[PDB]
Design a protein around this ligand. Structure first.
Ligand code: GTP
Ligand code: GDP
Ligand code: CA
Ligand code: MG
Ligand code: MG
Lengths: 439, 58, 421
């Protein structure tokens, strides 16, 4: 019951899926061959980790996951990598020609040739569920598959599964690791198309993750492997309530009630602490109060923006490890004085959850293994700054129609560009309206 | 509860129709774009036949 | 999986085409007999982009050699790596073009074009996922310019959804083979503007000035110029041949480089002709450009930078940011983040580290203005027009070619003067 199906789309989605599922296996004691010695119920069960893993008769714990890419290079590495025995071959779907950083190719030209197979394979996972809760879609904004194919898939999932919940992990583009000039186009197009099909989207700004790896982990030139191992820690904190059980554990959907005051205002800001190297964590234990105070330091946010210049509509703290409520309440009382402006229509309390399962690190990684960690999910108007930066780059290029011929040549019309941009303009205006005081 | 069912079905219906509208409009535009490209290349072939014919008349 | 079909047409095209295969076979550890004797698995990971695998673990270049005379191709079969080409992929005529674009495009070349297309289809049919085509030719000759632009048009009819890339050699009076070269160049540009997705402008005037002034060669030969072409062609194709994520195929490169379909003529750059700051600075210098254009006379639409060798990626990131900030005036504001950088660990042969520059600059109009000036200096007096009207052409087709290249320059000037606000 309460199963969750993960869908990893495109290079970014797939490679982040590698990091997350490896981390999950480490957290649950699952070996690269899917065997879990601590699991005594063979073939099935109703344990908390079964929301993310199905079980075979041979004792294999299989991710409830689908990996889809329009080219085979990235998923072939999964088919031959360390966890190749973890996935059944039909969960790894590849094409031959990618979308060439073109949203139109991912949504139409190339993506329409594989969408039926992908939906068929998703249906096979859903048929194994006794009470499917929803989907988690992992994708980049900037790539042609990550943007175009994800939009096509989200539209088709709404049809085939109704209003069943769909959550997104979206990679917001950063120039330090960007691979395409048209990424602002692909970003605006996929956001407009998915907006009414997504219930909750966690944006990850590559530049924010890049700066965190450089500043806190002392990595001179972070790679995707550096970024993805950090991203998986946040993803793990968010999903930990689904995969583990505990007396003080608060279900993610219960946070979601507080995080989404209106259907379109569904973009939580995520902040994670502590991100610290082994060298600095040695003989330096970070308390509940220290990691909580780091959640309000803007340099620890997953999206570059300034909540100090915005209003809060919700604040959720997701603790994991050695954490008791007495310390949390004390730490929160300190922050409410030294730091947090709410809109006048929303209660100012902080919603707290604690999973006592301690954090895990991947061997050979750069993160220190700490005794306690915290992910803050806040709903702040300041996240609209990330839409503004993206919409400004869109406007600069589109006013000259730069690169638009690559999209028209694949069947798109200029009307879709202006329609998508006007949706973003209304979205920015929506984030302003929710912050204005009542009359 | 009847209203909740109707709202969910209307959402499914509107989404299925918008998507089919887009996929059909996109198929025609890309085919029209390719048909115009081939027609320009085929007019260059007709011009090549007139060049070789003009030389034959010299 | 993603294959490129290579075509070389005419004297210049077969010459620089052979030099291209010699250099990349060396980098991929391929001997003239087609066998692999390399030391790094990174050489064979993307070997299928330019090589077919045959019986006996042989690697045969996916190349098609075309010419209207057997003179140049007979030396290719006898030169180094001459036995590595597929013998059936040699398609040569006898009559020749006589440095006449009309002969290569309409008469002599059209009689041979069908036999070339038969080899194109045979190579394309065995491709797991054809990327597109790349052509090496000159624009000042007859077979490369005339039959080259003809082959481009005919291939685009059967493969309209594939990328068409050309390495086009621009004529210069400093290496002039004949006098009707401004006619052949203008007629070829008229075609390349409509039927190619991306064109590297290998300007002979720039190659000569580099050999003479920089390389200190008082009497540069065609072999000295082609050594610059081989080093340039090896650079711009690095991202296609080695594992990477930036401009790794022809279409992603076009999407990053071509903001408007007609403005697809790139300025190549190479360095050196040694630290990362010096390598970056020389890479953006006008004296290192393979086209006779000063980039500081225009503005950059898009740029692809490729660094090869072992170096600090942190230092490369800083130096590429440094050159954009200190020279922001020469990058259009309405295209944010228009400079992309790739790094490959395998350097070229004989260098610790090198850099290759691919630029879409509005200053390329200086090259098209020079050829248009040499064109109008002859067309206004109807000089040498009997070479072309005798094959069936008319003065109307010459004027249309002149007007289209003049429109290309106007369009490059339009976006040079365009502002964000
Ligand atoms: N954080 C993170 N970002 C990535 C990763 N891989 C790619 N990206 C980012 O994603 C964007 C490019 O999208 P991709 O996912 O590579 O493209 P794609 O979805 O495969 O689509 P196409 O290749 O065009 O068909 C750029 O912003 C990259 O910086 C990754 O592993 N981790
Ligand atoms: N860089 C370079 N340019 C060449 C070479 N051979 C010919 N050219 C140029 O090409 C033009 C002549 O074209 P050519 O190839 O001889 O005509 P074709 O044989 O009919 O295709 C002249 O402007 C020369 O400058 C060469 O080997 N290297
Ligand atoms: Ca069990
Ligand atoms: Mg991809
Ligand atoms: Mg010659």
């Amino acid at each position: 019951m309460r199963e969750c199906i993960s869908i990893h789309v495109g290079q970014a989605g797939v490679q982040i899926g590698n990091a997350c599922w490896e981390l999950y296996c480490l957290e649950h004691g699952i070996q690269p061959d899917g065997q879990m010695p601590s699991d005594k119920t063979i073939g099935g069960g109703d344990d908390s980790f079964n929301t993310f893993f199905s079980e075979t008769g041979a004792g294999k714990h299989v991710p409830r996951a689908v990996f889809v890419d329009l080219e085979p290079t990235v998923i072939d590495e999964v088919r031959t990598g360390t966890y190749r025995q973890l996935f059944h071959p039909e969960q790894l779907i590849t094409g031959k020609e990618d979308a060439a950083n073109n949203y139109a190719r991912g949504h139409y030209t190339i993506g329409k040739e594989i969408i039926d197979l992908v939906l068929d394979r998703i249906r096979k996972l859903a048929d194994q569920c006794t009470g499917l809760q929803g989907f988690l879609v992992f994708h980049s904004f900037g790539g042609g598959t990550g943007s175009g194919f994800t939009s096509l898939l989200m539209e088709r999932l709404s049809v085939d599964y109704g209003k069943k919940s769909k959550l997104e992990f979206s990679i917001y583009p950063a120039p330090q690791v960007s691979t395409a000039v048209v990424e602002p186009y692909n970003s605006i197009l996929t956001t407009h198309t998915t907006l009414e099909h997504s219930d909750c989207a966690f944006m990850v700004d590559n530049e924010a993750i890049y700066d965190i790896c450089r500043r806190n982990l002392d990595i001179e030139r972070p790679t995707y492997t550096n970024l993805n191992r950090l991203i998986s820690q946040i993803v793990s904190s968010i999903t930990a309530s689904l995969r583990f059980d505990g007396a003080l554990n608060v279900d993610l959907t219960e946070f979601q009630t507080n995080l989404v005051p209106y259907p379109r205002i569904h973009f939580p800001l995520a902040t994670y602490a502590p991100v610290i190297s082994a060298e600095k964590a040695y003989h330096e234990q970070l308390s509940v109060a220290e990691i909580t105070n780091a959640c309000f330091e803007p340099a620890n946010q997953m999206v570059k923006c300034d909540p100090r210049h915005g209003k809060y509509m919700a604040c959720c703290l997701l603790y994991r490890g050695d954490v008791v409520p007495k310390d949390v309440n004390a730490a929160i009382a300190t922050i409410k004085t030294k730091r947090i402006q709410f809109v006048d229509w929303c209660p100012t309390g902080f919603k707290v959850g604690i999973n006592y399962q301690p954090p895990t690190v991947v061997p050979g990684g750069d993160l220190a293994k700490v005794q306690r960690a915290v992910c803050m999910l806040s709903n702040t108007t300041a996240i609209a700054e990330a839409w503004a930066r993206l919409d400004h780059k869109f406007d600069l290029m589109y006013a000259k129609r730069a690169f638009v011929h690559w999209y028209v040549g694949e069947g798109m019309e200029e009307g879709e560009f202006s329609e998508a941009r006007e949706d973003m303009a209304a979205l920015e205006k929506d984030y302003e309206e929710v912050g204005v005081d009542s009359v | 509860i009847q209203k909740a069912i109707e709202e969910n079905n209307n959402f499914i219906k509107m989404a299925k129709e918008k998507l089919a509208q887009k996929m059909e409009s996109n198929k025609e535009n890309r085919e029209a774009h390719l048909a115009a490209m081939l027609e320009r290349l085929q007019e260059k072939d007709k011009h090549a036949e007139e060049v070789r014919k003009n030389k034959e008349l010299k | 999986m993603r294959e490129i079909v290579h075509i070389q047409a005419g004297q210049c095209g077969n010459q620089i085409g052979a030099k291209f295969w010699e250099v990349i076979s060396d980098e991929h550890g391929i001997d003239p007999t087609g066998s692999y004797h390399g030391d790094s698995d990174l050489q064979l990971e993307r070997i299928n982009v330019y090589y077919n695998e045959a019986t006996g673990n042989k690697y045969v270049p996916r190349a098609i050699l075309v010419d209207l005379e057997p003179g140049t191709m007979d030396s290719v079969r006898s030169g180094p790596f001459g036995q590595i080409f597929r013998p059936d992929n040699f398609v040569f005529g006898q009559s020749g073009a006589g440095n006449n674009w009309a002969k290569g495009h309409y008469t002599e070349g059209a009689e041979l074009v069908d036999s070339v297309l038969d080899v194109v289809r045979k190579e394309s049919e065995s491709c797991d996922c054809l990327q597109g085509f790349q052509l090496t030719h000159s624009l000042g000759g007859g077979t490369g310019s005339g039959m080259g632009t003809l082959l481009i048009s005919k291939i685009r009819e059967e493969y309209p959804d594939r990328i068409m890339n050309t390495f086009s050699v621009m004529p210069s009076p400093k290496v002039s083979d004949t006098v009707v070269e401004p006619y052949n160049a203008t007629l070829s540009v008229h075609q390349l503007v409509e039927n190619t997705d991306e064109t590297y402008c290998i300007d002979n005037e720039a190659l000569y000035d580099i050999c003479f002034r920089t390389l200190k060669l008082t009497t540069p030969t065609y072999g000295d110029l082609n050594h610059l072409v081989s080093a340039t062609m090896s650079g711009v194709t690095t991202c296609l041949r080695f594992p990477g994520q930036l401009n790794a195929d022809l279409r992603k490169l076009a999407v990053n480089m071509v903001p408007f379909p007609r403005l697809h003529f790139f300025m190549p750059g190479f360095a050196p002709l040694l630290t990362v700051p010096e390598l970056t600075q020389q890479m953006f210098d006008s004296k290192n450009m393979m086209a006779a254009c000063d980039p500081r006379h225009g503005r950059y639409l898009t740029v692809a930078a490729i660094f090869r060798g072992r170096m600090s990626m942190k230092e490369v990131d800083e130096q590429m940011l440094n050159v954009q900030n200190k020279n922001s005036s020469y990058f259009v504001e309405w295209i944010p983040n228009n400079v992309k950088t790739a790094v490959c660990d395998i350097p070229p042969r004989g260098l610790k580290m090198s850099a290759t520059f691919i630029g879409n600059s509005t200053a390329i109009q200086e090259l098209f203005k020079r050829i248009s000036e040499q064109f109008t200096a002859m067309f206004r007096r109807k000089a040498f027009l009997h070479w072309y009207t005798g094959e069936g052409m008319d003065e109307m087709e010459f004027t249309e070619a002149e007007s289209n290249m003049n429109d290309l320059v106007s369009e490059y000037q339009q976006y040079q003067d365009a502002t964000a606000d």
